[PDB]
Design a protein around this ligand. Structure first.
Ligand SMILES: NC(=O)C1=CN([C@@H]2O[C@H](COP(=O)(O)OP(=O)(O)OC[C@H]3O[C@@H](n4cnc5c(N)ncnc54)[C@H](OP(=O)(O)O)[C@@H]3O)[C@@H](O)[C@H]2O)C=CC1
Ligand SMILES: NC(=O)C1=CN([C@@H]2O[C@H](COP(=O)(O)OP(=O)(O)OC[C@H]3O[C@@H](n4cnc5c(N)ncnc54)[C@H](OP(=O)(O)O)[C@@H]3O)[C@@H](O)[C@H]2O)C=CC1
Ligand SMILES: NC(=O)C1=CN([C@@H]2O[C@H](COP(=O)(O)OP(=O)(O)OC[C@H]3O[C@@H](n4cnc5c(N)ncnc54)[C@H](OP(=O)(O)O)[C@@H]3O)[C@@H](O)[C@H]2O)C=CC1
Ligand SMILES: NC(=O)C1=CN([C@@H]2O[C@H](COP(=O)(O)OP(=O)(O)OC[C@H]3O[C@@H](n4cnc5c(N)ncnc54)[C@H](OP(=O)(O)O)[C@@H]3O)[C@@H](O)[C@H]2O)C=CC1
Ligand SMILES: O=C(CO)[C@@H](O)[C@H](O)[C@@H](O)CO
Ligand SMILES: O=C(CO)[C@@H](O)[C@H](O)[C@@H](O)CO
Ligand SMILES: O=C(CO)[C@@H](O)[C@H](O)[C@@H](O)CO
Ligand SMILES: O=C(CO)[C@@H](O)[C@H](O)[C@@H](O)CO
Ligand SMILES: O=C(CO)[C@@H](O)[C@H](O)[C@@H](O)CO
Ligand SMILES: OC[C@@]1(O)OC[C@H](O)[C@@H](O)[C@@H]1O
Ligand SMILES: OC[C@@]1(O)OC[C@H](O)[C@@H](O)[C@@H]1O
Ligand SMILES: OC[C@@]1(O)OC[C@H](O)[C@@H](O)[C@@H]1O
Ligand SMILES: OC[C@@]1(O)OC[C@H](O)[C@@H](O)[C@@H]1O
Lengths: 263, 263, 263, 263
């Protein structure tokens, strides 16, 4: 199936590793030029080198903190300078949380609000004008199954991912007039490096069977009884930003191996 | 994007016309063998001829009423004897309703229950064993935006589409162990022959501006301010049934141009 | 808080025991006249005697099967004959299921469709005209948390309760015209006789710790870690049908001790 | 129906006018002592006197901005000094928004985050320990129908109300162990002073029929074709915080006259 995105310019936040890098590789495979954004310069360089080598597309690296307005401004200026504008934006930079409401400091709430919600707000303000001028575009917000089905250990993440899912919907209705299609994807358990790190930490004192820990997580939460690979998730992002998904507007698509317990 | 559908056997109910026919074309383009199912065989012949001649695929026609156990039984036996079993099943046969609860006959409720729900129940019972023996497969239920956001004029359709959406989710958890992935797609406004007929009928005594009537429907319901084509919807069915959507289990995916008013 | 229902006529289906009887007690305590409906004649008569003597209200028994058109007809005519019409209707008659989709007979699907959905359809057609003529009323559908969050062992019940929840919503928008307010309540774990019977059956060969079995069900499903009493659930039904809940229209109210895992 | 809240201490944020004032009057009618909280001292002083005079309960005035940590701390300290602790908390202080995403300033996003979300976080942190020590309690978050069904003109309000609805759910699971029951209410169109002010502003140049403007808003959005009164809505708050609603945990209850378009 032709995706029709060859030569389009795709900005992916948090794309030096995990889901965001698999998304970038997915778009590059379809011939899209890539703007990679993350904090660490080294991983960003490898990601870009590998994408250009494997796929022969143009890749721009932007090494900034998208949780800050300065960082978002830098992404916008870099896109402008190298490409003029973006055709596709994926908001993916983020991380899990771990607290109780009774104990967490206000600054932690603020941190996740800036990272998960305000990055998406600021990136839309900053890149929508360019997208409009190019004749339209696609914007995806990678929220989480937790945006509707909260995990007990991470209330701050649950609340801010819920906010992001609503933001996606409100943005979709605002910019569809510009031929810009905005949607949300809500992943379930996706095997990424922090899950492995966590699995090791949590099994340090009971035998170190970190793969067993992960399997028990999957057994508890997902009828499919396994984690997804980032590549398998990335396919959905590529499809949703393609010329084949032109009636998808303001929707939330769960990719979760059965983990969502309700309709 | 490679779909990995070539040589797979896809059974599409209600595929002589409209959305089901567009789905069959979408699968044929990707090299799938097609089982077309509908009541009126003239349209089945025409559809099957076109698919064979345009796409070079094998097409089996089954002219039966899927709202009956006997019709379903014939579909199952036609598939087993011609192909061994199915890889893909798309439950699509259906039609809208038009009544009030206060006036509708019990028999009309029964008709939609048989057509929209029992067809899917009976096809799963009949086809899942063959699918299991083949190593897995994909089942999609084409319900509707009305399965969650009911349209005032068709309460029976709303209730039975809602039931179909829940059926999809229950079947998903029962059969995922067999590597059979079940999902639901809920379309919004899709321009099919019956919409054009209704438009012409509702405007016959006021100017015959049927295109104007359809535009007013789109303006009322969809932020994108147009109907989708069957072809644009069909892309989503092909993708969900492909090797690229292997983590989608028990999900409901709206394809509705913004029509869904909630998260 | 004054409920304003003294002297109102409340029809409760399935009210010779369990939740339905508790709802009838709740209404009787607020001075409503009661129409009790169930199949077993003596059980129903004794439930009626107890209400009448404990609460001093009028109680009318209709001993019929509400899954049949003839049973519903009898209810409507008994209400018309004794009271003129109803002010309140609670659709409650029902029972759980237990099957797989692969094994269940078509006849079992039909039974639950008639009992859970058509009973509500037929009672609305039969009773709404009298309620209209009385100046308005309240209709509640007792569905289940399973109408949105399906339990693995009972797919038929999940599908038909989902259908009922949608019916509630469609009826709500049809009759609000007439000052009839329709809503749905979705209960979680409610300790009724069949739960106790099941706990005793499933523990007969491992120590008979039936209370232990029920506690394990509560621990698995509900954050509150207990079942509700029917009486505690009944309060919500009485409130929703009162003069105090006059803006509740087309809503679904979960009363579930935290069991719903999503927003 | 006895609510069983006589002598309980209820803290209602934003309770000098509109919905919050109506909720305070509803709890006072049931014998509850009241903590009234709002910014404008004169209105608050007046409302407190009136309540004390009319219902003969204790009324504590705390004139602070609950969007600030200092304001929340002053509520917590005043409650501690006068009453020891709270039995009931209603998070109600808030206001609508009006902007586009493309035009709104970062500071406006922050303002609503602090007002609608952080107020509830901070008040929960501050009051839950006193509630736990008193043996349990009830907390309600007054979010909005917009938390799930966004209104086009107020994206910031929609996003922050959605965040609040998720916060309510996450808090509910964290504190049910303390016998503290947390729920969300999502009102539809409630006739409050700002609706009247808006209706006048918007009809200033087209005839001044502000009541007609409000009727058109209700006709557009609500099947019941009217606004609710704040007193109508307040009944639901009082009921949910009563001894009759003891199995309501982590639920969201819409009170919206049919405005929600989906299940
Ligand atoms: N993994 C999972 O199970 C699921 C993940 N998600 C969502 O997927 C998204 C990505 O997660 P995942 O791939 O697991 O995470 P990883 O930690 O593997 O990757 C996160 C990426 O984001 C970057 N990043 C983090 N913070 C910032 C920042 N402030 N500014 C710029 N870049 C940043 C990281 O690079 P660097 O540190 O150099 O900045 C890295 O490239 C997140 O939004 C997460 O919520 C949703 C559901 C499930
Ligand atoms: N069009 C739209 O805007 C939307 C449609 N849908 C759903 O899409 C599905 C397809 O509808 P659409 O393409 O619009 O309609 P069409 O009328 O164009 O296609 C319906 C197909 O179903 C077949 N069919 C109907 N009843 C039976 C039956 N008892 N047994 C076997 N085949 C049957 C019809 O052929 P025959 O009559 O010869 O049997 C025809 O092939 C339906 O389920 C509909 O509810 C959902 C949302 C929106
Ligand atoms: N208990 C629970 O945990 C939950 C229950 N529910 C729902 O609550 C409702 C009541 O259930 P519950 O109280 O537990 O069940 P019970 O079996 O304890 O009570 C059912 C009542 O309905 C009557 N009844 C059953 N079938 C019919 C029929 N065909 N016609 C007329 N009356 C009938 C029964 O009497 P008779 O047999 O004599 O006809 C009895 O009076 C059901 O709809 C159930 O699905 C929802 C969520 C949870
Ligand atoms: N009216 C409606 O149709 C709907 C309203 N709601 C929600 O209901 C809640 C009440 O709104 P409503 O009654 O309409 O509005 P009003 O403006 O009439 O009342 C708001 C109350 O909150 C107070 N308040 C506002 N900001 C603060 C603050 N920062 N700190 C302390 N008190 C504050 C106000 O007093 P002061 O200005 O002096 O501080 C006032 O007493 C809001 O959360 C709103 O979003 C939800 C759905 C619909
Ligand atoms: O979104 C999820 C799980 O789906 C969260 O648990 C994590 O924060 C995720 O980012 C993996 O670390
Ligand atoms: O859009 C979706 C995904 O299907 C949502 O509707 C979810 O089902 C949930 O947030 C509410 O139904
Ligand atoms: O699902 C829809 C449109 O959203 C139904 O109302 C129609 O009946 C459709 O099946 C074709 O008319
Ligand atoms: O029907 C009954 C009675 O056993 C319930 O237990 C259902 O399984 C379900 O509604 C529980 O919420
Ligand atoms: O919640 C609503 C209406 O449903 C918002 O439009 C406003 O903020 C309201 O609170 C003020 O009029
Ligand atoms: O997962 C099994 C399978 O047959 O399901 C249907 C897919 O089209 C096909 O690619 C896949 O191999
Ligand atoms: O005693 C219960 C009852 O149903 O018994 C039968 C009587 O006819 C009726 O009046 C009465 O309420
Ligand atoms: O709204 C009509 C009515 O009969 O509905 C049922 C309520 O119990 C009653 O108080 C009310 O007046
Ligand atoms: O529980 C969240 C919610 O919005 O889910 C959908 C239901 O309509 C409603 O009852 C419920 O409040």
């Amino acid at each position: 199936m032709d995706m029709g995105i060859s030569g389009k310019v795709a900005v992916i936040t948090g794309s030096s590793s995990g889901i965001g890098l698999a998304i970038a590789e997915g778009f590059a495979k379809e011939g899209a030029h890539i703007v990679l954004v993350a904090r660490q310069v080294d991983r960003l360089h490898e990601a870009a080198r590998s994408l250009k080598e494997k796929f022969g597309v143009r890749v721009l690296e932007v090494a900034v903190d998208v949780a800050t307005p300065e960082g978002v401004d830098a992404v916008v200026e870099s896109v402008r300078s190298s490409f003029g504008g973006a055709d596709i934006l994926v908001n993916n930079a983020g991380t899990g949380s771990n607290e109780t409401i009774m104990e967490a400091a206000d600054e932690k709430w603020q941190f996740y609000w800036e990272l998960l919600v305000m990055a998406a707000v600021r990136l839309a303000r900053g890149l929508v004008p360019g997208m409009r001028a190019r004749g339209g575009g696609a914007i995806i917000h990678n929220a989480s199954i937790c945006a509707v089905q909260p995990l007990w250990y991470e209330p701050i993440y649950n609340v801010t991912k819920a906010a992001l899912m609503m933001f996606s919907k409100t943005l979709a209705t605002e910019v569809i007039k510009d031929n810009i299609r905005v949607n949300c994807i809500n992943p379930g358990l996706i095997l990424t490096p922090d899950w492995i790190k966590t699995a090791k930490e949590l099994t340090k004192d009971n035998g170190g069977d970190w793969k067993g820990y992960l399997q028990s997580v999957a057994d508890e939460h997902a009828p499919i009884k396994r984690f997804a690979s980032p590549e398998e998730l990335a396919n959905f992002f590529v499809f949703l930003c393609s010329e084949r998904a032109t009636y998808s507007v303001g929707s939330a698509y769960f990719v979760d191996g059965g983990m969502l317990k309700t309709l």
